[PDB]
Design a protein around this motif. Structure first.
Motif, PDB file in Angstrom:
ATOM      1  N   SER A 129     -26.303  -7.810 -17.904  1.00 30.70           N
ATOM      2  CA  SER A 129     -25.246  -8.341 -17.068  1.00 30.70           C
ATOM      3  C   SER A 129     -24.515  -7.280 -16.251  1.00 30.70           C
ATOM      4  O   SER A 129     -23.721  -7.619 -15.368  1.00 30.70           O
ATOM      5  N   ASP A 130     -24.805  -5.999 -16.486  1.00 32.80           N
ATOM      6  CA  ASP A 130     -24.138  -4.964 -15.678  1.00 32.80           C
ATOM      7  C   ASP A 130     -24.440  -5.112 -14.170  1.00 32.80           C
ATOM      8  O   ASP A 130     -23.679  -4.638 -13.317  1.00 32.80           O
ATOM      9  N   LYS A 131     -25.604  -5.652 -13.811  1.00 30.47           N
ATOM     10  CA  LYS A 131     -25.945  -5.664 -12.388  1.00 30.47           C
ATOM     11  C   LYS A 131     -24.954  -6.553 -11.615  1.00 30.47           C
ATOM     12  O   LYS A 131     -24.394  -6.149 -10.593  1.00 30.47           O
ATOM     13  N   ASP A 132     -24.708  -7.777 -12.092  1.00 30.56           N
ATOM     14  CA  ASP A 132     -23.712  -8.610 -11.447  1.00 30.56           C
ATOM     15  C   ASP A 132     -22.314  -7.974 -11.556  1.00 30.56           C
ATOM     16  O   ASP A 132     -21.544  -7.942 -10.576  1.00 30.56           O
ATOM     17  N   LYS A 133     -21.977  -7.482 -12.751  1.00 28.56           N
ATOM     18  CA  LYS A 133     -20.610  -7.094 -13.013  1.00 28.56           C
ATOM     19  C   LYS A 133     -20.263  -5.781 -12.328  1.00 28.56           C
ATOM     20  O   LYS A 133     -19.102  -5.575 -11.952  1.00 28.56           O
ATOM     21  N   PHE A 134     -21.249  -4.913 -12.118  1.00 24.88           N
ATOM     22  CA  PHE A 134     -20.984  -3.725 -11.300  1.00 24.88           C
ATOM     23  C   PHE A 134     -20.691  -4.128  -9.853  1.00 24.88           C
ATOM     24  O   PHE A 134     -19.766  -3.616  -9.217  1.00 24.88           O
ATOM     25  N   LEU A 135     -21.427  -5.101  -9.318  1.00 28.90           N
ATOM     26  CA  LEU A 135     -21.104  -5.567  -7.973  1.00 28.90           C
ATOM     27  C   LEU A 135     -19.687  -6.155  -7.937  1.00 28.90           C
ATOM     28  O   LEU A 135     -18.905  -5.888  -7.012  1.00 28.90           O
ATOM     29  N   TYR A 136     -19.317  -6.926  -8.965  1.00 30.22           N
ATOM     30  CA  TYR A 136     -17.959  -7.467  -8.984  1.00 30.22           C
ATOM     31  C   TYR A 136     -16.915  -6.367  -8.963  1.00 30.22           C
ATOM     32  O   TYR A 136     -15.901  -6.478  -8.272  1.00 30.22           O
ATOM     33  N   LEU A 137     -17.128  -5.325  -9.757  1.00 25.58           N
ATOM     34  CA  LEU A 137     -16.209  -4.188  -9.771  1.00 25.58           C
ATOM     35  C   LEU A 137     -16.044  -3.605  -8.367  1.00 25.58           C
ATOM     36  O   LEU A 137     -14.928  -3.301  -7.925  1.00 25.58           O
ATOM     37  N   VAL A 138     -17.166  -3.445  -7.667  1.00 26.88           N
ATOM     38  CA  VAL A 138     -17.152  -2.829  -6.335  1.00 26.88           C
ATOM     39  C   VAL A 138     -16.407  -3.727  -5.366  1.00 26.88           C
ATOM     40  O   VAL A 138     -15.571  -3.266  -4.573  1.00 26.88           O
ATOM     41  N   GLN A 139     -16.692  -5.028  -5.429  1.00 22.41           N
ATOM     42  CA  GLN A 139     -15.962  -5.978  -4.588  1.00 22.41           C
ATOM     43  C   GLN A 139     -14.469  -5.965  -4.873  1.00 22.41           C
ATOM     44  O   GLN A 139     -13.639  -5.966  -3.945  1.00 22.41           O
ATOM     45  N   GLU A 140     -14.095  -5.906  -6.150  1.00 18.93           N
ATOM     46  CA  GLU A 140     -12.680  -5.883  -6.512  1.00 18.93           C
ATOM     47  C   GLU A 140     -11.978  -4.580  -6.131  1.00 18.93           C
ATOM     48  O   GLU A 140     -10.806  -4.585  -5.701  1.00 18.93           O
ATOM     49  N   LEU A 141     -12.665  -3.444  -6.291  1.00 16.87           N
ATOM     50  CA  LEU A 141     -12.071  -2.202  -5.817  1.00 16.87           C
ATOM     51  C   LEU A 141     -11.855  -2.216  -4.304  1.00 16.87           C
ATOM     52  O   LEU A 141     -10.815  -1.797  -3.792  1.00 16.87           O
ATOM     53  N   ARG A 142     -12.862  -2.665  -3.559  1.00 18.69           N
ATOM     54  CA  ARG A 142     -12.711  -2.735  -2.112  1.00 18.69           C
ATOM     55  C   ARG A 142     -11.519  -3.606  -1.699  1.00 18.69           C
ATOM     56  O   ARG A 142     -10.754  -3.215  -0.795  1.00 18.69           O
ATOM     57  N   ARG A 143     -11.371  -4.774  -2.330  1.00 18.03           N
ATOM     58  CA  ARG A 143     -10.224  -5.640  -2.015  1.00 18.03           C
ATOM     59  C   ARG A 143      -8.917  -4.962  -2.343  1.00 18.03           C
ATOM     60  O   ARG A 143      -7.970  -5.011  -1.555  1.00 18.03           O
ATOM     61  N   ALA A 144      -8.860  -4.264  -3.475  1.00 21.32           N
ATOM     62  CA  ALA A 144      -7.637  -3.516  -3.809  1.00 21.32           C
ATOM     63  C   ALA A 144      -7.369  -2.401  -2.811  1.00 21.32           C
ATOM     64  O   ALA A 144      -6.211  -2.089  -2.489  1.00 21.32           O
ATOM     65  N   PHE A 145      -8.429  -1.750  -2.352  1.00 19.17           N
ATOM     66  CA  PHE A 145      -8.226  -0.668  -1.403  1.00 19.17           C
ATOM     67  C   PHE A 145      -7.733  -1.210  -0.091  1.00 19.17           C
ATOM     68  O   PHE A 145      -6.932  -0.554   0.606  1.00 19.17           O
ATOM     69  N   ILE A 146      -8.214  -2.406   0.261  1.00 16.42           N
ATOM     70  CA  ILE A 146      -7.765  -3.025   1.532  1.00 16.42           C
ATOM     71  C   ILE A 146      -6.284  -3.356   1.368  1.00 16.42           C
ATOM     72  O   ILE A 146      -5.452  -3.071   2.257  1.00 16.42           O
ATOM     73  N   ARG A 147      -5.917  -3.895   0.215  1.00 18.67           N
ATOM     74  CA  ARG A 147      -4.500  -4.256  -0.004  1.00 18.67           C
ATOM     75  C   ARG A 147      -3.585  -3.069   0.049  1.00 18.67           C
ATOM     76  O   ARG A 147      -2.435  -3.196   0.487  1.00 18.67           O
ATOM     77  N   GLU A 148      -4.051  -1.896  -0.386  1.00 16.42           N
ATOM     78  CA  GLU A 148      -3.171  -0.756  -0.351  1.00 16.42           C
ATOM     79  C   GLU A 148      -2.926  -0.326   1.080  1.00 16.42           C
ATOM     80  O   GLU A 148      -1.885   0.280   1.407  1.00 16.42           O
ATOM     81  N   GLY A 149      -3.862  -0.631   1.962  1.00 19.56           N
ATOM     82  CA  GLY A 149      -3.627  -0.405   3.374  1.00 19.56           C
ATOM     83  C   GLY A 149      -3.696   1.047   3.826  1.00 19.56           C
ATOM     84  O   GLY A 149      -3.183   1.373   4.904  1.00 19.56           O
ATOM     85  N   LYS A 150      -4.298   1.933   3.030  1.00 16.39           N
ATOM     86  CA  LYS A 150      -4.354   3.337   3.457  1.00 16.39           C
ATOM     87  C   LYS A 150      -5.719   3.738   3.992  1.00 16.39           C
ATOM     88  O   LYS A 150      -5.934   4.892   4.313  1.00 16.39           O
ATOM     89  N   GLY A 151      -6.632   2.791   4.141  1.00 19.45           N
ATOM     90  CA  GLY A 151      -7.957   3.084   4.689  1.00 19.45           C
ATOM     91  C   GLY A 151      -8.849   3.876   3.737  1.00 19.45           C
ATOM     92  O   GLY A 151      -9.762   4.572   4.178  1.00 19.45           O
ATOM     93  N   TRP A 152      -8.625   3.759   2.441  1.00 17.58           N
ATOM     94  CA  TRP A 152      -9.403   4.554   1.469  1.00 17.58           C
ATOM     95  C   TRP A 152     -10.878   4.197   1.513  1.00 17.58           C
ATOM     96  O   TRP A 152     -11.243   3.011   1.680  1.00 17.58           O
ATOM     97  N   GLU A 153     -11.740   5.196   1.330  1.00 15.47           N
ATOM     98  CA  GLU A 153     -13.176   4.928   1.224  1.00 15.47           C
ATOM     99  C   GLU A 153     -13.577   4.620  -0.214  1.00 15.47           C
ATOM    100  O   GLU A 153     -12.889   5.028  -1.168  1.00 15.47           O
TER     101      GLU A 153
END
Ligand SMILES: CC(=O)N[C@@H]1[C@@H](O)[C@H](O[C@@H]2O[C@H](CO)[C@@H](O[C@@H]3O[C@H](CO)[C@@H](O)[C@H](O)[C@H]3NC(C)=O)[C@H](O)[C@H]2NC(C)=O)[C@@H](CO)O[C@H]1O
Ligand SMILES: CC(=O)N[C@@H]1[C@@H](O)[C@H](O[C@@H]2O[C@H](CO)[C@@H](O)[C@H](O)[C@H]2NC(C)=O)[C@@H](CO)O[C@H]1O
Ligand SMILES: *[C@@H]1O[C@H](CO)[C@@H](O)[C@H](O)[C@H]1NC(C)=O
Ligand SMILES: *[C@@H]1O[C@H](CO)[C@@H](O)[C@H](O)[C@H]1NC(C)=O
Length: 383
Positions: free
Chosen positions: A137-161
């Protein structure tokens, strides 16, 4: 608009003598993106683990590194979580549920704000790997982690990579990486096109061959840099998201007793664990580039240096010791190939293992090659 991505190891400062390499040794203008390695994750609370707090926090390691941007404002300074020594099981545990991923994402966001980093590089080795505490199940859940980090980074609004270091073997991709979906969420994919051969494989060979050799069979057939990058493309990653790793180190072996055949593929003493440790890295099975050139390239060297004509990499041997690596000739070939394929750029593991002292000749000879080629190169539109 090509990248030169430089991983910086925070433990290199403890190497003795001329091996000592700290923040002040980073040749910042040779890189476009520099990544402080590593932080980890806690086993129990899924928070950011600071692995050497006396150095990273008390002596201001993280902040000294990010404040390099004052004099070098066009460079991005990020931090990498994971790495080989951290293991995989804490990561498989952290991604297993939405609530534990969210705890980690919040911890990451606080940490990146606290130490003024520009973003995060994910180096979990590897999702799905049974040998590293992973499971299906890591394959799905690693993608979820990446999607969730990206959304959090967008929310912080600092343009983080958000980037990730990834393997190139098909079985690892199938077990761990939803390629098109990951390549969409990430700013760059740092391909670990190295450690492709080594003591674990049971025979001596160079570890970053560019092309297939005749002895490459079964699982090894496509395990070379050209075919591995082609695999990422075939699985759906755009050419202008792929950054090609170049190792500034060699994989070494101790050959089997009485073995006088030094060719690629020759049998080794596997129980030895690799070649004997070199003086600065002190690790069986690998040598920094500067440890190799100071032994192999001196005028009176008793090492014999050869060339893999198909893989386009040097190897050298003396006695029972054999090491395969990258030198200026092989790096130049790979830089030209990166431009021919249209990839986003070059990455190095790791900048603290270049000949940064000029023990053999030009200081920082290998990263200067990456910088020379990449800085004059325009990345084309996706193929
Ligand atoms: C992006 C990327 O290439 N990631 C991986 C790297 O982790 C890996 O290099 C190896 O990294 C580990 C740390 O994760 C090194 O272990 C360290 O060993 C020294 C002493 O020998 C010890 O003092 C350190 O504490 C320990 N690290 C930490 C976190 O404290 C290991 O020596 C590195 N191996 C090398 C440089 O050849 C590279 C290259 O294998 O590839 C990925 O696996
Ligand atoms: C393929 C295999 O037999 N797996 C183990 C290796 O993972 C491991 O060394 C590592 O080689 C990997 C390629 O399979 C690299 O991705 C990884 O970077 C490298 N580890 C490091 C950082 O030193 C070896 C033990 O050293 O064991 C193998 O069994
Ligand atoms: C951070 O820079 C300060 C001031 O130069 C220095 O004293 C300190 O050793 C540096 N710390 C690290 C980890 O490089
Ligand atoms: C070299 O590494 C070995 C294996 O971890 C360790 O036991 C030894 O103390 C190290 N020697 C030095 C000089 O760091």
């Amino acid at each position: 608009r090509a990248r030169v991505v430089c991983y910086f190891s925070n433990w290199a400062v403890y190497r003795p003598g001329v091996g000592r390499y700290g923040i002040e040794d980073i040749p910042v203008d040779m890189c476009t993106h520099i990544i402080y390695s590593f932080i980890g994750v806690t086993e129990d609370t899924q928070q950011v683990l600071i692995i050497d707090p006396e150095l990273d926090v008390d002596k201001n390691g993280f902040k000294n590194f990010t404040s390099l941007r004052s004099k070098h404002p066009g460079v991005k300074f990020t931090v990498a979580v994971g790495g080989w020594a951290e293991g995989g099981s804490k990561y498989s545990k952290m991604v297993a549920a939405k609530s534990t991923r969210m705890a980690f994402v919040r911890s990451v966001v606080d940490f990146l704000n606290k130490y003024n980093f520009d973003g995060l590089d994910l180096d979990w080795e590897y999702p799905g790997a049974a040998d590293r505490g992973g499971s299906f199940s890591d394959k799905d859940k690693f993608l979820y982690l990446v999607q969730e980090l990206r959304r959090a980074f967008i929310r912080e609004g600092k343009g983080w990579e958000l980037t990730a270091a990834v393997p190139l073997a098909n079985f690892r991709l199938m077990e761990g990486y939803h390629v098109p979906e990951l390549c969409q969420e990430l700013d760059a994919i740092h391909v670990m096109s190295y450690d492709l051969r080594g003591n674990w494989a049971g025979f001596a060979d160079v570890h970053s061959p560019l092309y297939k050799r005749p002895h490459d069979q079964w699982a090894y057939e496509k395990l070379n840099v050209n075919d591995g990058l082609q695999l990422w493309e075939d699985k759906g990653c755009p050419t202008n998201k792929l950054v090609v790793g170049i190792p500034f180190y060699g994989r070494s072996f101790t050959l089997s007793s009485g073995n006088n055949n030094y060719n690629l593929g020759t049998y080794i003493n596997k129980e030895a664990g690799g070649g004997d440790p070199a003086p600065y890295t002190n690790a069986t099975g690998f040598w920094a580039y500067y440890e190799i050139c100071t032994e192999v390239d001196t005028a009176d060297s008793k090492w014999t240096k050869k060339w893999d004509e198909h893989g386009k990499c040097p190897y050298a041997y003396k006695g029972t010791q054999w090491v395969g690596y990258e030198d200026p000739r092989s790096v130049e070939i790979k830089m030209n190939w990166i431009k021919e394929k249209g990839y986003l750029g070059a990455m190095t593991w790791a900048i603290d293992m270049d000949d940064f002292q000029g023990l053999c000749g030009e200081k920082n000879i290998l990263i200067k090659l990456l910088h020379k080629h990449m800085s004059a190169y325009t990345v084309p539109p996706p193929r």
